[PDB]
Amino acid sequence: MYLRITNIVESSFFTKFIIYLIVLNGITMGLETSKTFMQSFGVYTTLFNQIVITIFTIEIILRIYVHRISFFKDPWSLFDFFVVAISLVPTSFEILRVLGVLRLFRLVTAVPQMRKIVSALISVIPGMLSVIALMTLFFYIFAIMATQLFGERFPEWFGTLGESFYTLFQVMTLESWSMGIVRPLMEVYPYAWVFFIPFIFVVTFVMINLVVAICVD
């Protein structure tokens, strides 16, 4: 019976079908948003999710036996598997349902062309780790400082290695960094800009290089 089921999972019919449910549950998950709607046909819908999830589980279960050890070294179906397993994680923390919406990323898994444009991006990740690790330590060394400078008067923003990491990141984005965060800060600590215009130059400079680093390909 082994060679029987082998024909099912990868038929032209199957993949398009899994894809189909994906776009469907994709849609279906997009409708499960409307409140007007659910009072009319809400039940009609909710079933289909488990359906897709079960099929996607069947798909995910089938995809398992035929490949055996082969299924468990691929990002995509494991993705789907999580995406399915997440989506399989029973209907009641509640985000699995939500990450169940990632099962609409199974669209990325079940559909070609998507798989490619995705993998093309990642190939760039390796050349940046040198830079990223720098950033995280860089942010961290600063997450330590901001906290023990500005946590005095500004506990919302720099009270915590957490909040300082947050607020710093926001300044990195240059979002309300001045009017929203620094000009306030400078009211209490007249010399704060010596921390931030540099933080801004530095992190501004670095981020750029990472890109030139990218345009190495």
Ligand X SMILES: C[C@H](CCC(=O)NCCC[N+](C)(C)C[C@H](O)CS(=O)(=O)O)[C@H]1CC[C@H]2[C@@H]3[C@H](O)C[C@@H]4C[C@H](O)CC[C@]4(C)[C@H]3C[C@H](O)[C@]12C
**Which residues form the interface with ligand X (CB under 6 A)?**
93, 95, 149, 189-192
| 129 counts as binding ligand PX4 under rule CB under 6 A | yes
Query: Under the phi-then-psi rule, with left for phi > 0, alpha for psi from -120 to 50, and beta for the rest, what region is 111?
Result: beta
Q: Say how far apart CA 155 and CA 183 lie, in whole Å.
A: 16
Among ligand PX4, ligand X, a copy of itself, none, the one that 75 touches (CB under a kind-dependent 5 to 8 A) is: none
- The region of 6-14, 22-30, 42-50, 63-71 touching a copy of itself under the rule CB under 8 A is 22-30
Query: C-alpha angle 76/81/42, rounded to 5°?
Result: 115
The one of a copy of itself, ligand PX4, ligand X, none whose footprint includes residue 178, by CB under 5 to 8 A per kind, is a copy of itself
Q: For residues 158 and 181, is the Cβ–Cβ distance under 8 A?
A: no
* Span 36-65, contacts to ligand PX4 by CB under 6 A: 36
> How far is residue 66's CA from residue 81's CA, in Å, rounded to a whole number?
15
Shortest gap between Cβ of 6 and ligand PX4 (angstroms)?
26
Can you tell me the distance from the alpha carbon of 151 to that of 144, in angstroms, rounded to the nearest whole number? 11
The whole-angstrom separation of Cα 70 and Cα 73 is 6
Element (H, E) at 113: none
Told to check if 152 binds ligand PX4 by CB under 6 A, we report yes
Which amino acid makes up residue 100? G
Q: How far apart are CA 178 and CA 170, in angstroms?
A: 11
Instruction: List CB contacts of 91: < 8 A, sequence separation 6 or more.
Output: 50, 97
Chain positions contacting ligand PX4, by CB under 6 A: 23, 26-27, 30-31, 33-36, 93, 95, 104, 107, 111, 113-114, 126, 129-133, 135-136, 139-140, 149, 152, 160-163, 165-166, 169, 186, 189-195, 197-198
Chain positions contacting a copy of itself, by CB under 8 A: 26, 29-30, 32-34, 98, 101-102, 104-105, 107-108, 113-114, 116-118, 120-121, 124, 130-131, 133-134, 137, 140-141, 143-145, 147-149, 156, 160-161, 166, 169-170, 173-181, 183, 193, 197, 200, 205-206, 208-209, 211-212, 214-217
